[PDB]
């Protein structure tokens, strides 16, 4: 708990030089076009451009703790905006290029971006979500719920119940939400393409899900500034900023990154929008 293994922290960053970065993003476009079922895996690296620190980056939460320094927030969680990467993921879902989305992030930004909760596994919880210990009914709040480790927030259930509301933030010893883990695993096993964005892939089982795609000859793409646990298993490793990589990908795909309306919750994926015709590859 105090001795919890925080893994490899503060590994050097790697930057693909510009011609190499351009060729690898063109190859990522090629895999998306060819794949039937694409699953995205996100971690803390996709929120660092919103001013939320990651865990194991050069200035991450655990890296700084290890050096006796403090991580720095440039926002609250309430005032944070979805990155270009978050809104790209909204669009790829809408046009049906993204089958499912698996996140380790607690920052509440996939939800708040309007990403459909029925295509989202939030494996480590959501700072904005409390759940009735009685009926399991979830509430997505406009402010962080105020506790971590699955404690009583002090609020009660309002479903026609009065059950005790608790946070959904897992502590080190807490096993993963069964529904979210089972859907993420099923999505990962069934995928022919798994793309990792801003996760070092050091947590079990979260970080191991993308390896399930390798079963039955799926492809694995890892986008990350630092080395990751599964680098040797990747068909393609892109070392660059996830916003640079995703803006370029969207341009190759002929998709706009959509406007953020402000914090909005979508329970269920809408009908799929029209998408560009595919290139002859
Ligand atoms: N803008 C960026 N572009 C690309 N890569 C980035 C960027 N920002 C950071 N990175 C990389 O993004 C990667 C983030 O790795 P980690 O910090 O381990 O976060 P996790 O989500 O995988 O942490 C998993 C869990 O462990 C924790 O205890 C919590 O429970 C977490 O939920 C780093 O390698 C950065 O190099
Ligand atoms: C960075 C982050 C989420 C990022 C995210 O979700 N990015 O997408 C959450 C902070 C609140 C954090 O988790 C933390 C945990 C334990 C701790 N101590 C045990 C002292 C100190 C801080
Ligand atoms: Zn209830």
Curated annotation (Swiss-Prot):
Deacetylase sirtuin-type domain segment(s) = 18-256
Q: What is the effect of changing residue 73 to A/E?
A: Reduced MDL-800 and MDL-801 compounds-binding
Please provide, in alphabetical order, the Gene Ontology terms of the cellular component aspect for this entry: chromatin; chromosome, subtelomeric region; endoplasmic reticulum; intracellular membrane-bounded organelle; nucleoplasm; nucleus; pericentric heterochromatin; site of DNA damage
Q: Give residue numbers for the modification (Phosphothreonine).
A: 278
Residues annotated as binding NAD(+): 44, 48, 55-56, 62, 104, 124, 198, 200, 224, 226, 242
Q: Which residues are annotated as active site? A: 124
Free-text remark on how the cofactor is bound? Binds 1 zinc ion per subunit.
What switches its activity on or off, per the activity regulation note? Compared to the defatty-acylase activity, the protein deacetylase activity is weak in vitro, and requires activation. The histone deacetylase activity is strongly activated upon binding to nucleosomes and chromatin in vivo. Two molecules of SIRT6 associate with the acidic patch of one nucleosome, while the C-terminal disordered region of SIRT6 associates with nucleosomal DNA, leading to efficient histone deacetylation. The protein-lysine deacetylase activity is also activated by long-chain free fatty-acids.
Q: What class of enzyme is it?
A: transferase
Domain of life here? Eukaryota
The entry's stated outcome for residue 47 to Y is: Abolished NAD-dependent protein deacetylase, defatty-acylase and mono-ADP-ribosyltransferase activities
Which keywords accompany this UniProt record? Acetylation, Acyltransferase, Chromatin regulator, Chromosome, Developmental protein, DNA damage, DNA repair, DNA-binding, Endoplasmic reticulum, Glycosyltransferase, Isopeptide bond, Metal-binding, NAD, Nucleotidyltransferase, Nucleus, Phosphoprotein, RNA-binding, Telomere, Transferase, Tumor suppressor, Ubl conjugation, Zinc
Q: Where is this site: Formation of an covalent adduct with nitro-fatty acid activators?
A: 9
Location in the cell reads:
Nucleus; Chromosome; Chromosome, Telomere; Endoplasmic reticulum
**Its Gene Ontology biological processes?**
base-excision repair; cardiac muscle cell differentiation; chromatin remodeling; circadian regulation of gene expression; determination of adult lifespan; DNA repair-dependent chromatin remodeling; double-strand break repair; glucose homeostasis
Domain comment as written in the entry: The C-terminal disordered region mediates non-specific DNA-binding.
Q: Subunit structure of this entry?
A: Homodimer; binds to nucleosomes and DNA ends as a homodimer. Interacts with RELA; interferes with RELA binding to target DNA. Interacts with SMARCA5; promoting recruitment of SMARCA5/SNF2H to double-strand breaks (DSBs) sites. Interacts with the mTORC2 complex; preventing the ability of SIRT6 to deacetylate FOXO1. Interacts with the CLOCK-BMAL1 complex; recruited by the CLOCK-BMAL1 complex to regulate expression of clock-controlled genes. Interacts with CSNK2A2; preventing CSNK2A2 localization to the nucleus.
Function field: NAD-dependent protein deacetylase, deacylase and mono-ADP-ribosyltransferase that plays an essential role in DNA damage repair, telomere maintenance, metabolic homeostasis, inflammation, tumorigenesis and aging. Displays protein-lysine deacetylase or defatty-acylase (demyristoylase and depalmitoylase) activity, depending on the context. Acts as a key histone deacetylase by catalyzing deacetylation of histone H3 at 'Lys-9', 'Lys-18' and 'Lys-56' (H3K9ac, H3K18ac and H3K56ac, respectively), suppressing target gene expression of several transcription factors, including NF-kappa-B.
Q: What is this protein called?
A: NAD-dependent protein deacylase sirtuin-6
Gene name of the record: SIRT6
Which residues of the parent chain are present? 13 to 297 of 355
